[PDB]
Design a protein around this ligand. Structure first.
Ligand code: GTP
Ligand code: GTP
Ligand code: GDP
Ligand code: MG
Ligand code: MG
Lengths: 430, 442, 52, 332, 442
């Protein structure tokens, strides 16, 4: 049960490099590609993410795409970069220009066929294909346009598989680019139709994790991408190791999404704690559960206390009793009962896996479906409405060729997504 | 990757000498175009490629042309220290100057020389594989810089099309002046520059003199100091193309982020750690102090006060040892300030860039050595005040036809003055209209 | 020929050169090789906290 | 010193069974490295910090480990480095006479503290002609070495160790002793009641060799033979046949022993194999750092693959290993 | 943590030289701004931070500006011994003095210099993270001290708002005088200072001369002695910020404890073990004797007699080897005395502070070395007689407008004299009313 990864744009390629470092470490793969691990449990599911080349070496089932090769040359030049298959790097000759329309319509359609050819070559070689995994930012140019284009093409070609996305989205507190609202609105419009499950992360939340929880004096983008790579590698853990209560991406989707538009989730990872403090507090399921529901440990700016949970899932790694897990999830549901949607009798799914991440006795990753995500989209829509009334930078997009009607359509679809989330928050059983 | 530099007239060639001196010293090419015979490693690196191409013997030669109608300045380049760096065909010189007449440069004299310039630029553009714009240096106060610069920009814009054209322009200072006919030439230049340029950077000599008096300790500055500051600014802006960094910025990203409407393309430029060596040991120079510095009007290189207008967009380029979190904290502190105001239709007002290469130190230079620097280009409605004073001086002179007989004799209809003056009036009205607030009622 | 002390006490210096204060000329000359500014303190990482 | 070093290195690829060449640059102002590929003219690795690499280890014929790859320095890739190493290429010989065998570990340690690189070593007995000509005793230790300002540095051995060292600087005498002392020939190793200890390449580059030999002398053991040999991959495999299927780090031991040259000593004492095993310590340095803190492997070992020294485990194989080191490798 | 020092005019700069001499010698920074040469480790302790900031190279620089309209005193600082300590921008000098005219400082001349001062203070305040007040040194008798001090305090009070501002002020002595126009300048100063100062410390040169004659054995004192005494007092008050102690006292606690009503903020200062070296080795200097000393009128630094009024609050600072039981026993002994009287609405009349750092000895100094010292600041109605006598001197001169034409010529209306005189009359009435018994009503 093997996943194919696609990494698009600068943010996606950078997070991907750290992800493949973390995965190669957990399975004991040397940066030369030689297996150097120390338990049979590592080898027995290696097929899930790696293909085997002749001899010792293993090669990772990933496609790298970018519009200017600077980032790709940096990732190929990195310390683990050699493991990647040379034929899997696809690049153009001129940048996205931070413009969605350029990335989607002009150079996108020029490159996109070679990416589908590589993805099809990789998929049809698999004996049974599980979902795709894609990392990209929504605020950028090449990330937004080709990521959503490629997602649409893969959804046309593999409608029976799973579609999973990890996405970084612009915050108003610390923007790097002026035209972020347009690109974000068009990308959310594409995702809500095409995707099966989409995960969202705010850079502001990663900075607050680093400064308040980890007390790092000088965090860097490598740290933010390491936290994201930790959650990404954690969600898939039950695919590739034994456990007392197995779980699967499809089982996650069936238990989390009540209605097909409501597929946007929050992320957290629990055993975050500073090196000075670690001597003072042992790991246990109550402690993990307390950190797990603390809004301090969530990777989005919206806070759970302003909404209600429709559904949530917790995947535990480590040797632990099921009784303590079940009663902790029951006690949290009973004590905070106003924050859980009342017409569902049990909102939390649990899963238990025997093999923890290296150097931790136990870990849990938390996925939550909460209506407070509407505030984030609303904030982006406000900035769009401020910019759109004055045609502030629109001639670039119109010069690529877009009709203004796309912008009003994308706004209407995002506004309808916000309305759909808001109605279930404010409702009675009747 | 590649950019082509076009230097026109006296100010543009003299600023070019400082620019190419700096770019040589930053990459390490010796003045004869070679590299040290010892430092060679076997496999060289692409960073020069933005500005230099190498011959098969390994000599470097730069992607520039020097254009003048009088010989003297180009003969100074041919006989100077950098004789061997430039290709001799690239250094084009006429017989006689345009004598402060835009008409003489544009109609009579530049028409003979212009086809050589296009042939040289074509020969350069054929030896490229990723050209991404033209950089142009000229002054609009003189005859050949205005007239031939306009004619050449028109021809370049028809032949090359969509490629971007970024101009660095020295405008006539608001009370320091050097020639009587400056208003006429600047108006007629600006008429052509409106249609055929993608971004225009504004300079005033009086501001760079003031900056060199207050921050540096120079009582008697001269043009070499100003030209070294301009060269440093250009090196800072093009560094994003040439070295590794956290947040790169391609030249098309400047135009996408800075220009909201196709006429609103005139921008202000400033540079932060202009400081002397003796001051440098009394002060630390963290990110937040230089970020606060770039917004003070004492730092600006154009004589305008931005407190009389509203910012529309800012582009902040950081080079050296800077970390993104400090940029974010600084920009949030700037955003907090009450004397800094943005138009309400531009909520996300800033674009950032971060590059690892620290600023270079020039052997004869007057700047201190510093670990980090920031450079800003920003779009603001305050620029409307600069045009209004030139227009007032034009109106004063044109009421009596003070010099017009030269221009009509050298080939121009009197009507062309009124057309240009009406176009600049419309540009002033555009800057009045763009700055308004509407639909307050909801 | 203008003597060195009187030239130190003149009102105007040479063209295009920075001038020191007259209460500072007797001191030893400054150093230009040194590069000024505070070094950023970059240490540790998130991997130690995530993977003890 | 330097602002940038430049060497070209070869890397033996086990999967491809080819030898690849790269270009390695070291920036000494901030301790970062960067690698390029000569065959492709492309970047192999950016400027990344690498604190385990120091300018002292950079010399020709050395071995370094960069991201689990063993790189062997081959030739200067720049003329700055060639000019800086204009000296340090002449080979001289220092002898240790009979009275100095008890102090030979301190002699080797003093040579290492003087930035001197040993290119060969052996314990031999010279013919009478060279014995009379040079002025040495019958049984002596011959050390061949090179380095910067070599003659002025080795003059200090005359006052630190009176009347036990002889220095040779004339090229003709060096050629004669190179032909005579080293090369194919006989050996002084015994064939019974012996044990073999092997100094791994990483300890050779780090240079704890003199301390190990002097500890062996101090404990009371006798050295009956000594030499340096370079092991091919097949030789390393045939040396560690008995460790296949028994220890989990067999292949890593193979590549470590084939990485570079190794020193092999012979020890004779009462119950030699058990005594040497006791003095070296258990196979894992982690056990040593807690329960056996005085052992050699505690001081000079970091894991199972690189525990510093190697000692015979089965008393049935001591003449086998002694023969393999002192006859098969030496003679042919 | 941080405090910023502003020095205005001649008296304030001369007192500043002694203050910064003392603070340097107490912390141990060399006159060139460096640490002692015997250490080879990084810095460990924050106590310098209240007054100095370090550069990345480890030089120290102090948190002060020197403001003057005449060059001579600042040029003396520029050419003196502490030349290397100060940043050259901090030493600000005009061209010509305010000529003992408040009008010249406030209206004509200070108006040109004031914007530079605010820009420097802003640049200082931006490099802080816990600023807790301004310290200001000036004399109200002279023209620039009065006019620029008032204008600058007004601007600081609008721009910075709630941040505290504490002034140390040299007032015109009640019969010693140096210039004829002292009453006019002091009245006009006091009018502005009433609205725009949070605590005012009162000084008279005649008292410090008397104290140096009686206690020290100095027949012929000069300004350096007085300035060193003032520096010791300021060091005692700011020591609570800088060193460990049993009972610390933050600058906001002064304001909370000493000021009963927002106008009643003028305080007297005195210092106990002013003693010579020959007397100092024959005697111990215990707590109860020096506590008895601070209440004797021979110890005060202002020429007023506290027996003509009632105390409202006292703040007692002990520094050195003192134990709390001795401070409590001393205050209990003081409280019994009948010639010391407190207003009946203030039953808990005392605040105590205890700091471990003993007073520093200066190589050229005249104070002895002592193991302990106490410094007192107290609010008392006796100050009303000083103002009443200044107002009487004003009324004598002002009845015929004896010199007013200078002030009216330099830009001031004659009406402003009467306004200020009526405001100070109201301040006098405040001191009669606050001191009026109220328990008589049942
Ligand atoms: N900053 C700077 N300004 C210059 C320099 N040289 C000339 N200028 C200014 O530019 C204006 C004069 O323009 P010129 O370049 O001399 O005119 P021109 O291009 O030679 O035109 P012709 O006189 O017809 O040959 C004046 O305002 C000068 O102050 C220079 O080297 N640096
Ligand atoms: N303690 C002390 N008092 C001084 C000193 N110099 C002057 N004074 C006193 O301050 C008052 C005079 O104020 P000045 O400082 O001379 O006035 P100014 O600031 O120079 O104002 P202008 O005369 O307009 O320049 C008189 O009461 C002097 O006794 C000094 O060095 N130390
Ligand atoms: N978390 C994270 N964010 C990044 C990284 N690189 C860029 N970003 C953010 O992504 C946005 C820029 O988008 P970008 O990737 O350049 O868009 P593109 O030009 O289409 O590839 C900004 O908000 C950056 O702060 C990274 O490595 N990690
Ligand atoms: Mg000219
Ligand atoms: Mg004065």
């Amino acid at each position: 049960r093997e996943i194919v990864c696609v990494q698009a744009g600068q943010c996606g390629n950078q997070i991907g490099s750290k992800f493949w470092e973390v995965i190669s470490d957990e399975h004991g793969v040397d940066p030369t590609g030689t297996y150097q691990g120390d338990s049979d449990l590592q080898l027995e599911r290696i097929n899930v993410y790696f293909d085997e080349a002749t001899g010792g070496r293993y090669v990772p089932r990933s496609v790298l795409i970018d519009l200017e090769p600077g980032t790709m040359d940096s990732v190929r030049a990195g310390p683990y970069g050699q493991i990647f298959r040379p034929d899997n790097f696809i690049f153009g000759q001129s940048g996205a220009g931070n413009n969605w329309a350029k990335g989607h319509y002009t150079e996108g359609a020029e490159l996109i066929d070679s990416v589908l050819d590589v993805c099809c070559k990789e998929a049809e070689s698999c004996d049974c294909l599980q979902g795709f995994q894609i990392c990209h930012s929504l605020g950028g140019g090449t990330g937004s346009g080709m990521g959503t284009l490629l997602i649409s093409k893969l959804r046309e070609q593999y409608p029976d598989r799973i579609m999973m996305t990890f996405s970084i989205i612009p915050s108003p507190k610390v923007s790097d680019t002026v035209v972020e609202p347009y690109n974000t609105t068009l990308s959310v419009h594409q995702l809500v139709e095409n995707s099966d499950e989409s995960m969202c992360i705010d850079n502001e939340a990663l900075y607050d994790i680093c400064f308040r929880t980890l007390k790092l004096t000088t965090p860097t983008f490598g740290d933010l991408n390491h936290l994201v790579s930790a959650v990404v590698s954690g969600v898939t853990c039950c695919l590739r190791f034994p456990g007392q209560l197995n779980s699967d991406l499809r089982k996650l989707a069936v238990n989390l999404v009540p209605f097909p538009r409501l597929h946007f989730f929050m992320m957290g990872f629990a055993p975050l704690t500073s090196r000075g403090s670690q001597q003072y507090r042992g790991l246990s399921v109550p402690e993990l559960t307390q950190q797990m529901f603390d809004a301090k440990n969530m990777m989005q700016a919206a806070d759970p206390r302003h909404g209600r949970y429709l559904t949530a899932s917790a995947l535990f790694r480590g040797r632990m009793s099921t009784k303590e897990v079940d009663e902790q999830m029951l006690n949290v549901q009973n004590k905070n009962s106003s924050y859980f949607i009342e017409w569902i009798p049990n909102n939390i799914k649990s899963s238990v896996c025997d093999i923890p991440p290296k150097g931790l006795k136990m870990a849990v990753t938390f996925i939550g479906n909460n209506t407070c995500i509407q505030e984030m989209f609303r904030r982006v829509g406000e900035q769009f409405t401020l910019m759109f009334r004055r045609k502030a930078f629109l001639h670039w997009y119109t010069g690529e060729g877009m009709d203004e009607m796309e912008f009003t359509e994308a706004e209407s679809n995002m506004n309808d997504l916000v309305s759909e989330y808001q109605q279930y928050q404010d409702a009675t059983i009747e | 990757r590649e950019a082509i530099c076009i230097h026109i007239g006296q100010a543009g060639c003299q600023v070019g000498n400082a620019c190419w001196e700096l770019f040589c010293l930053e990459h390490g090419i010796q003045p004869d175009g070679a590299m040290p015979s010892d430092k060679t490693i076997g496999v060289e690196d692409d960073a020069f490629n933005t500005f230099f191409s190498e011959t098969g013997a390994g000599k470097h030669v730069p992607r520039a042309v020097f254009l003048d109608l009088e010989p003297t300045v180009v003969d100074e380049v041919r006989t100077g220290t950098y004789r061997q760096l430039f290709h001799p065909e690239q250094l084009i010189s006429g017989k006689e100057d345009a004598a402060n007449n835009y008409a003489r440069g544009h109609y009579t004299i530049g028409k003979e020389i212009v086809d050589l310039c296009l042939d040289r630029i074509r020969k350069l553009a054929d030896n490229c594989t990723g050209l991404q714009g033209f950089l142009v240096y000229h002054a609009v106060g003189g005859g050949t810089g205005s007239g031939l610069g306009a004619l050449l920009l028109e021809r370049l814009s028809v032949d090359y099309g969509k490629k971007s054209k970024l101009g660095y322009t020295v405008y006539p200072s608001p009370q320091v002046s050097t020639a009587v006919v400056e208003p006429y030439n600047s108006v007629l230049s600006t008429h052509s520059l409106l249609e055929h340029t993608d971004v225009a950077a504004m300079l005033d000599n009086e501001a760079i003199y003031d900056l060199t008096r207050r921050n540096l300790d120079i009582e008697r500055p001269t043009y070499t100091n100003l030209n070294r500051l301009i060269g440093q600014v250009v090196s800072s802006l093009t560094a994003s193309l040439r070295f590794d960094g956290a947040l790169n910025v391609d030249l098309t990203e400047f135009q996408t982020n800075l220009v909201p409407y196709p006429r609103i393309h005139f921008v202000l430029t400033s540079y932060a750690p202009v400081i002397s060596a003796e001051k440098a040991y009394h002060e630390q120079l963290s990110v937040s102090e230089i970020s606060n510095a770039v917004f003070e009007p004492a730092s600006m290189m154009t004589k305008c006060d931005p407190r009389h207008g509203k910012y529309m967009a800012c582009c902040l380029m950081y080079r050296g040892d800077v970390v993104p979190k400090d940029v974010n904290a600084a920009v949030a502190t700037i955003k907090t300030k009450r004397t800094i105001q943005f138009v309400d239709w531009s909520p996300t007002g800033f674009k950032c860039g971060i590059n690892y290469q620290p600023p270079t130190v020039v052997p004869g230079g007057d700047l201190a050595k510093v670990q980090r620097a920031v450079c800003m280009i920003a779009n603001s409605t305050a620029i409307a005040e600069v045009f209004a004073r030139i227009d007032h001086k034009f109106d004063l002179m044109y009421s009596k036809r003070a010099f017009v007989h030269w221009y009509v004799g050298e080939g121009m209809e009197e009507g062309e003055f009124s057309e240009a003056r009406e176009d600049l009036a419309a540009l002033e009205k555009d800057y009045e209209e763009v700055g308004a607030e509407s639909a307050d009622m909801d | 020929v203008t003597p060195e002390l009187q030239r130190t006490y003149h009102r105007f210096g040479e063209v295009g050169c920075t001038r020191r204060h007259y209460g500072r000329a007797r001191d030893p000359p400054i150093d230009e090789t040194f590069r000024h500014g505070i070094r950023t303190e970059a240490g540790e990482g998130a991997r130690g906290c995530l993977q003890p | 010193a330097l602002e940038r070093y430049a060497f070209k290195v070869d890397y033996c690829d086990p999967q491809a069974n080819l030898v690849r060449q790269y270009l390695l640059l070291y920036f000494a102002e901030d301790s970062t490295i960067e690698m390029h590929d000569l065959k492709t003219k492309r970047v192999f690795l950016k400027r990344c910090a690498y604190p385990s690499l120091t300018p002292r280890e950079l010399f020709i014929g050395a071995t370094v480990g960069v991201f689990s790859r063993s790189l062997k320095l081959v030739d200067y890739g720049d003329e700055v480095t060639r000019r800086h190493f204009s000296g340090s290429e002449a080979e001289f010989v220092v002898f240790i006479q009979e009275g100095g065998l008890c102090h030979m570990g301190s002699i080797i340690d003093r040579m290492h503290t003087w930035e001197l690189r040993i290119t060969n070593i052996r314990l031999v007995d010279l013919p009478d002609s060279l014995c009379r000509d040079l002025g040495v005793s019958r049984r002596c230790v011959a050390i061949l070495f090179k380095g910067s300002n070599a003659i002025e540095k080795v003059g200090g051995l005359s006052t630190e160790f009176p009347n036990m060292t002889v220095v040779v600087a004339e090229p003709s005498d060096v050629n004669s002793v190179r032909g005579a002392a080293f090369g194919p020939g006989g050996t002084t190793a015994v064939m019974k009641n012996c044990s073999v200890c092997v100094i791994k390449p990483h300890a050779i580059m780090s240079g704890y060799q003199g301390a190990i030999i002097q500890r062996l002398i101090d404990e009371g053991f006798h050295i009956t033979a000594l030499g340096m040999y370079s092991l091919t991959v097949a030789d390393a495999e045939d040396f560690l046949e008995v460790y296949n299927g028994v220890v989990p780090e067999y292949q890593r031991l193979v590549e470590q022993m084939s990485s570079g040259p190794c020193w092999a000593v012979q020890v004779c004492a009462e119950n030699s194999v058990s005594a040497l095993r006791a003095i070296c310590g258990p196979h894992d340095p982690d056990v040593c750092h807690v329960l056996f803190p005085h052992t050699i492997r505690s001081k000079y070992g970091v894991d199972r693959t690189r525990n510093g020294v190697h000692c015979t485990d089965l008393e049935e194989d001591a003449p086998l290993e002694s023969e393999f080191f002192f006859s098969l490798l030496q003679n042919a």
